[PDB]
């Protein structure tokens, strides 16, 4: 239709990819998926209530942390209901409801309405305690006053959606392979390797005679396998690889309609470079112009009580209580299997139990599917994200195992889906098929909530504009989401995508007009400013929503405050004005555009940091972390949130001494001066101690605590925070300037440094209580976030770091040891840091 085809062009521009393309495809799994996601989209949109969907109340059922009550020791909240002039400050109770609250206002005013926060697209509605709104806790945690404005409920009419209406051994013939360009140094040979895979696990492997690596190499040789056609499990993967490893490609032997792949195929392959999630994609290489290829032929159809002793039961248990990174063995597996009804009564044993299943045999898989049939213990157990996330990684390809995994996620409330959305989304790369429990689950949660949906949009978009391996799949999941969020949501995303395109065009140009040789010369300096105008004209929207912070709505770009950070690279530093007039602060909005870093690795790292707070919180601890917003929007490019009143530590040093040259007291001077009243400098020391320990533990477990001062920042208010995360040693950073702030010197004691270790070990062991969770996220971050890593050696770092095994009491000491190693280096390495880091 003249406009229907027009709408698709819209969704296409938003999505950054053309789902309506069938150029790079060899079947119809995608279309079937769009076809298939239509249902899930429909059930949810219909189900979602406009009354709450249009205001996305953001709340939690978790208990208000123990470190957030001193604020309210009078069981009285100081909400400050605004309006237009009369800002009456009502008093409510930590239990009152946005309804009751509206009462203590109209009850205090005499002779519909909703209370959204001032300067933010956040409403405080819904039958939920005023203490269960993340905002109220945000205000309580920052000493800020809980404000709010009396305004009418948003016309839900806006959340309007456009109208919607054999028992033979497996065989495989390798015809040959081809590549346009040949002339490559060596005159070596090459062979093809066909592997039948299921969950990383190879179930068979066949090769080919080493023929010379010429422009074209035909083999016309059948590759007979041992596995029988009735044993190939759903999810199985024919992994073709070229060795001389330089090229790989995959092809599911069992389609989406439960049929066995049969026919001629010309697969364009991915190039390798010298484990990670890309080697797993069922996608073919889009660039059929200069990429290796392989012709194969497929032609061969539906789909297919005593009690453990005591000593052995003592053996099974020792297996169960082991980290995920600890491999298994022929015996452990046979043990876990033969007693599959025993190990079944233990949820934590599911990952290991399913790793001992011989998927390459119909009979065994058949039994396995019968094991799952009864999930009393699992379905009844408390939700364990660690364990759940484990059944969604690269090791589980059976949809039924993975399926129960999503079954527990179903039990997650928004606030928790926000804490994991990113990894949940990265986990879709492990799914063997496009349409899946996990996708269906992400898609629904997106539609049911505008916050999750906003973040789903960018997380998926991040993958589509950068991942050839997984764009088609993500794009298809995105389009499905876009057709259910609403007309408003669309208007928003559109405005957002436009602003970034241009600001990204500006970003790359400036980087060009500026040589490696540090400059920020008059010229480029005059250029950026000149550039920031050709856009502020009309094209660049008068306003737009902030991708890393959905509430905030940026307006005009304050050219007068925009610049270009030094850095080898040339990140851009932009600032806008809040498009909301009801704001009660002068604070503009600072976003940092940059090119050069894999801004995805950053995202993941900040994601983990928010998961380390959440943990610390449940254990009543607060290490004041500042995981700033960051959204990767393309290959080596994205945006960064700008924390107000923050300075690099290095600059804090060279702000008293010299350049090339470190006064241990430089920091304590900055804090006292950059602070009005002493009552405040006291605070600053407080927030500095907590957040300081915070990045100490966190950065350590992650193995990213050895960084040059230039990547460490602090605020005039006391909060410190690391930055830059895209990839004499040391644990972390506890330099004399910090140590000094706490009040200490070479080997000493203090009311603060004592607090420092006091807060650390407590937060550290707290993390140790989530060893398995941390390991799994960690292990998923490498597989989808970093190049290609050994499925052992690289993940193993997290295992030694978190010191799995050791008794708490020891670890309690282990940390401190690492702490003393600090003094041992004083300014050693920090002074050294100019060279480089490796290994
Ligand atoms: O990877 C990276 N490359 C860069 O240039 C970075 C700079 C940066 C990051 C966060 C900030 N937050 C508040 C203030 N200033 C900031 C500066 S991070």
């Amino acid at each position: 239709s003249e406009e229907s085809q027009a709408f698709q062009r819209q969704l296409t521009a938003l999505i950054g990819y053309d789902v309506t393309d069938v150029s790079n495809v060899h079947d119809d799994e995608l279309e079937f998926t769009r076809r298939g996601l239509v249902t899930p989209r429909m059930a949810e949109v219909a189900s979602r209530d406009p009354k709450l969907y249009a205001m996305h109340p953001w709340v939690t059922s978790k208990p208000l942390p123990e470190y957030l009550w001193k604020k309210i020791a009078n069981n009285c909240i100081f909400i400050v209901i605004h309006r237009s002039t009369t800002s009456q400050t009502i008093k409510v109770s930590p239990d009152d409801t946005p309804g009751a609250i509206l009462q203590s206002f109209f009850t205090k005013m005499a002779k519909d309405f909703v209370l959204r926060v001032c300067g933010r697209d956040e409403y405080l509605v819904g039958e939920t305690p005023i203490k269960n709104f993340q905002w109220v806790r945000h205000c309580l945690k920052n000493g800020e006053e809980i404000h709010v404005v009396l305004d009418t409920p948003p016309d839900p009419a806006l959340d309007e959606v456009r109208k919607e209406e054999c028992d033979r051994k497996f065989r495989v013939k390798i015809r040959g392979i081809d590549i346009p360009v040949l002339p490559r140094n060596t005159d070596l040979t090459v062979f093809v390797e066909a592997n039948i895979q299921h969950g990383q696990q190879v179930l068979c492997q066949r090769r080919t005679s080493p023929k010379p690596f010429t422009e074209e190499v035909l083999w016309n040789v059948w590759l007979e396998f041992s596995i029988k056609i009735k044993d190939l499990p759903k999810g199985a993967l024919l992994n073709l690889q070229i060795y001389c490893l330089l090229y790989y490609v995959n092809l599911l032997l069992i389609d989406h309609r439960f049929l066995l792949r049969r026919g001629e195929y010309v697969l364009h392959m991915w190039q390798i470079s010298g484990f990670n999630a890309d080697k797993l994609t069922s996608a073919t290489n889009p660039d059929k112009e200069n990429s290796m290829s392989i012709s194969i032929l497929l032609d061969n159809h539906p789909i297919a009580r005593a009690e453990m002793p005591n000593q052995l039961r003592k053996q099974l248990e020792a297996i169960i209580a082991t980290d995920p990174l600890n491999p298994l063995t022929a015996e452990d597996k046979e043990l876990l299997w033969h007693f599959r009804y025993e190990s079944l009564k233990h949820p934590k044993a599911y990952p290991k139990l399913f790793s001992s299943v011989k998927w390459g045999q119909q009979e065994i898989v058949a039994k396995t599917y019968q094991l799952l049939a009864r999930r009393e213990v699992w379905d009844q157990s408390a939700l364990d994200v660690g364990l759940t996330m484990q059944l969604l990684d690269c090791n589980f390809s059976d949809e039924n195992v993975r399926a129960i995994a999503v079954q527990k996620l179903e039990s997650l409330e928004d606030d928790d889906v926000l804490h994991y959305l990113l990894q949940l989304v990265q986990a879709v790369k492990f799914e063997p098929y496009h349409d899946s429990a996990l996708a269906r689950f992400l898609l629904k949660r997106g539609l049911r909530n505008k916050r999750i949906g906003h973040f789903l949009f960018w997380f998926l978009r991040s993958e589509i504009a950068q991942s050839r391996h997984y764009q088609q799949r993500f794009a298809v999941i995105l389009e499905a989401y876009l057709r259910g969020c609403g007309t408003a949501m669309l208007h928003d995303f559109t405005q957002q995508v436009q602003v970034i395109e241009m600001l990204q065009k500006v970003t790359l140009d400036i980087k060009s007009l500026s040589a490696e040789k540090y400059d920020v010369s008059s010229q480029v300096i005059s250029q950026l400013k000149q550039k920031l105008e050709n856009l502020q004209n009309s094209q660049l929207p008068e306003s737009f929503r902030v991708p890393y912070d959905p509430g905030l709505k940026a307006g005009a770009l304050a050219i007068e405050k925009c610049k270009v950070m030094a850095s080898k690279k040339k990140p851009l530093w932009l600032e806008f004005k809040c498009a909301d007039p009801t704001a009660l602060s002068n604070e503009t909005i600072g976003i940092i555009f940059k090119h050069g870093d894999d801004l995805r690795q950053d995202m993941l790292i900040l994601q983990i940091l928010r998961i380390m707070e959440s943990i610390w919180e449940t254990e009543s601890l607060d290490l004041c972390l500042l995981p700033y917003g960051c959204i990767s929007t393309g290959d080596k490019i994205g945006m960064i949130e700008i924390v107000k009143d923050a300075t690099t530590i290095a600059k804090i040093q060279q702000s008293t001494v010299g350049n090339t040259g470190f006064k241990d007291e430089v920091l304590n001077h900055w804090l006292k001066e950059k602070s009005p009243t002493e009552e405040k400098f006291q605070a600053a020391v407080e927030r500095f101690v907590y957040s300081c320990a915070g990045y100490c533990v966190a950065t350590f477990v992650l193995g990213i605590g050895d960084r040059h001062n230039d990547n460490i920042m602090i605020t005039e208010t006391g909060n410190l925070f690391h930055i830059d995360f895209g990839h004499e040693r040391v644990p972390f950073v506890l330099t004399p300037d910090f140590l000094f702030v706490m009040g200490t010197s070479g080997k000493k004691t203090s009311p603060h440094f004592q607090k420092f270790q006091d807060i650390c070990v407590k937060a550290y062991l707290a993390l140790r209580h989530h060893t398995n969770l941390l390991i799994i996220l960690f292990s998923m971050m490498l597989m989808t976030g970093m190049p290609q890593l050994t499925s052992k050696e690289d993940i193993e770092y997290i295992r030694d770091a978190l010191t799995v095994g050791k008794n708490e009491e020891d670890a309690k000491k282990y940390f401190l040891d690492q702490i003393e190693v600090c003094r041992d280096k004083g300014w050693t390495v920090q002074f050294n840091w100019f060279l480089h880091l490796v290994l």
Side-chain angles (χ1 to χ4, degrees), residues 567 571 592 594 597 602 628 640-643 713 721 723-725:
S567 302
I592 290 177
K594 188 218 311 168
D597 296 311
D602 276 54
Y628 50 83
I640 281 74
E641 170 191 8
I642 283 182
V643 192
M713 300 198 49
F721 69 91
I723 73 180
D724 258 276
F725 292 111

Side-chain angles (χ1 to χ4, degrees), residues 274-286:
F275 294 113
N276 91 287
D278 299 332
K279 283 278 286 66
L280 264 175
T281 203
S282 62
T284 297
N285 185 348

